[PDB]
Design a binder for this molecule. Structure first.
Ligand SMILES: Cc1cc2nc3c(=O)[nH]c(=O)nc-3n(C[C@H](O)[C@H](O)[C@H](O)COP(=O)(O)O)c2cc1C
Ligand SMILES: Cc1cc2nc3c(=O)[nH]c(=O)nc-3n(C[C@H](O)[C@H](O)[C@H](O)COP(=O)(O)O)c2cc1C
Lengths: 178, 178
């Protein structure tokens, strides 16, 4: 097993991939934007808190700070092209609001085709190096009827997985319950 | 598409799964513990920062606060049984240090068999509801040659995935690069 001491950013920072990209939806007045975020994680069960790490370089960063409300939606493999397209262009150069979406209960935009989505109120924002963590409280839930299993778990093979640097995949259908 | 307002903890909080479980290794004096953490994410590229969200109920939590150093290791689907075991029992009841492991450059314990691992210096801890986010700086990197690709991602299909509530999988073999 090879090793090295870190001396700055890693030659690839992909060791913990793949991950499910969360699609971050945000609205400020008429303007809707979407941004995939693979740097995402649950943060608390009670209360339900979910976080997304967003670079201050993203158009989405300013919109979140203004809106203080956002969606995180989770999309099937079949939407790989759309998710990659949302993550390869900025709202500085393209109205990604033209992407098919709807407004949730709190008025946050939610990208269409998702098997699940959270509406979130922004609770806190924390800077860690070159990204800011946006901590949202889940205030509403959208779920596709039957793309989730008995305990609320997305069905094997369905989820879009991101491997980093524009490489995508999906879970295998085989599961293990040891 | 079904929806509801959040009224406390969610019936299932698995909408964003599967994820790669990071195995969190920690050492205090002669005592070594491990803890899988599916709530994990990259937090910064420059500098390289990585977070794990750990409940104050975990034996690991106090050890992390004392040691200020830990590992995060990433394991192949073959080690599904070991990873599940480590997150099914507490260091309060069983010496998990007995799991085969080595010490890293900075003396953190790294569980054997990982395709990759970080040695981390603890930078910050933040409370978000019922879990604490431990923000580590990657100070060293371990890689299993030939299990990672050209850019550093684990080879297609190798990663252990966790679906929540004791269910596991792996990524599909096929990858797609739009
Ligand atoms: C699959 C995928 C995952 C991504 N994950 C993140 C992320 O976690 N945080 C982030 O700041 N950018 C991430 N990006 C980059 C942004 O999505 C990308 O810069 C996007 O064009 C930003 O659009 P915006 O400027 O309209 O906000 C990701 C991109 C892709 C394709
Ligand atoms: C796959 C898996 C992922 C887990 N993810 C987390 C996590 O992100 N944060 C956490 O606090 N516990 C998590 N747990 C629970 C701990 O791993 C479990 O409570 C473990 O027994 C803690 O051991 P400890 O008391 O020695 O720290 C997870 C468990 C499993 C099996």
């Amino acid at each position: 097993m090879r090793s090295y001491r870190a001396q700055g950013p890693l030659p690839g920072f992909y060791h913990y991939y793949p991950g499910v990209p969360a699609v971050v939806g945000v609205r400020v007045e008429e303007r809707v934007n979407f941004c995939p975020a693979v740097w995402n994680t649950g943060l608390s069960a009670d209360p339900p808190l979910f976080g997304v790490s967003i670079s201050p370089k993203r158009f989405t960063h300013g919109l979140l700070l203004k809106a203080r409300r956002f969606s995180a939606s989770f999309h099937p493999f079949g939407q790989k092209d759309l998710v990659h397209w949302l993550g390869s262009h900025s709202g500085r150069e393209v109205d990604k609001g033209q992407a098919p979406h709807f407004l949730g209960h709190t008025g946050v935009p939610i990208l269409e085709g998702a098997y699940a989505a959270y509406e979130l109120e922004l609770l806190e924002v924390h800077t860690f190096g070159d990204h800011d963590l946006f901590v949202g409280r889940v205030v509403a839930v959208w779920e596709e009827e039957g793309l989730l299993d008995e305990k609320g778990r997305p069905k094997p093979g369905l989820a879009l997985l991101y491997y980093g640097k524009g490489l995508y995949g999906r879970p295998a259908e085989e599961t293990f319950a040891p």
